[PDB]
Amino acid sequence: YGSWEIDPKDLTFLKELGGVVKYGKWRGQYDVAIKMIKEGSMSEDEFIEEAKVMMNLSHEKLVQLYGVCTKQRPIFIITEYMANGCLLNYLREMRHRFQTQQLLEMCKDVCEAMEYLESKQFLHRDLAARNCLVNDQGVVKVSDFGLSRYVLKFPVRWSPPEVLMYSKFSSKSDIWAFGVLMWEIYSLGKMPYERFTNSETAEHIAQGLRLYRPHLASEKVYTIMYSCWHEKADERPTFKILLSNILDVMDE
Numbered sequence: 001y002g003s004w005e006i007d008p009k010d011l012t013f014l015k016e017l018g019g020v021v022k023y024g025k026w027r028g029q030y031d032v033a034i035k036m037i038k039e040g041s042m043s044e045d046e047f048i049e050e051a052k053v054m055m056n057l058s059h060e061k062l063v064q065l066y067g068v069c070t071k072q073r074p075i076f077i078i079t080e081y082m083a084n085g086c087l088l089n090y091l092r093e094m095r096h097r098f099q100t101q102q103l104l105e106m107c108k109d110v111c112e113a114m115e116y117l118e119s120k121q122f123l124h125r126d127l128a129a130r131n132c133l134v135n136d137q138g139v140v141k142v143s144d145f146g147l148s149r150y151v152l153k154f155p156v157r158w159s160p161p162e163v164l165m166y167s168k169f170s171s172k173s174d175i176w177a178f179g180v181l182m183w184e185i186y187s188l189g190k191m192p193y194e195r196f197t198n199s200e201t202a203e204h205i206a207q208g209l210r211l212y213r214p215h216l217a218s219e220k221v222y223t224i225m226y227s228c229w230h231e232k233a234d235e236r237p238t239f240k241i242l243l244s245n246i247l248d249v250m251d252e
């Protein structure tokens with residue numbers, strides 16, 4: 001086995017998470033999530049080459065890749081286990097009665113992950129609340145960064161005009177998605193453009209219209225998410241700038 005390969009005989013399966021994705025242990029002790037990849041769904045040899053690079057991405061707010069099990073059908077992706085599950089579902093649980101400082105911390109967690117990926121010139125390509133996870137300490141981490149490249153729903157609601165019009169993907173299309181994610185956080189997990197179809201959303205956006213302020217977002221927080229939606233990609237901030245903006249708000 002190479003350094004990116006896990007021997008599946010070292011896994012114990014403990015529970016279904018949803019896929020299929022299972023919770024288990026590696027060598028009896030260490031918690032892991034085990035993603036079983038359905039036959040025909042993935043460009044597996046391309047993915048495995050990329051997994052070698054994903055092995056070296058390491059940031060506290062990025063869900064860690066531990067390795068892949070490649071010698072059989074199906075293959076498995078082994079990652080960090082996140083006990084509190086998907087961010088979208090967490091936001092929607094009304095029992096949490098979240099304070100806005102907790103929402104802002106979620107945004108900062110993601111922004112830190114994305115600033116790291118940006119520093120490595122690595123695009124997420126599908127940033128959204130559904131691709132973020134929550135651990136037992138309430139920390140949000142970004143998952144499945146880059147993964148859509150190996151898949152054989154397009155995220156219209158998280159895409160800037162130049163993606164929808166021309167298929168122009170860049171750092172600035174991740175920025176636009178991050179602004180939509182902040183909106184999802186402050187809206188407690190509402191679907192963006194909830195009364196529109198994808199086709200209507202694409203028109204709305206291309207005509208220069210936008211999401212508007214969630215009730216829980218202060219004017220300062222709204223200005224940060226809104227800055228991600230400039231019609232001109234080059235006038236959108238970087239993740240570094242966004243992180244400084246989010247820290248300034250926390251301080252005020």
Ligand SMILES: CCC(=O)Nc1cccc(Nc2nc(Nc3ccc(OCCOC)cc3)ncc2F)c1
Nearest residue numbers: 017018021033079080081082083084085086088130
């Ligand atoms: C919103 C999107 C969405 O559901 N995505 C999704 C679903 C299932 C598994 C994965 N992957 C991973 N999950 C965990 N932890 C996890 C924990 C609890 C949980 O609760 C049971 C579900 O319903 C109670 C679900 C997942 N850790 C790492 C993963 F890689 C991603």
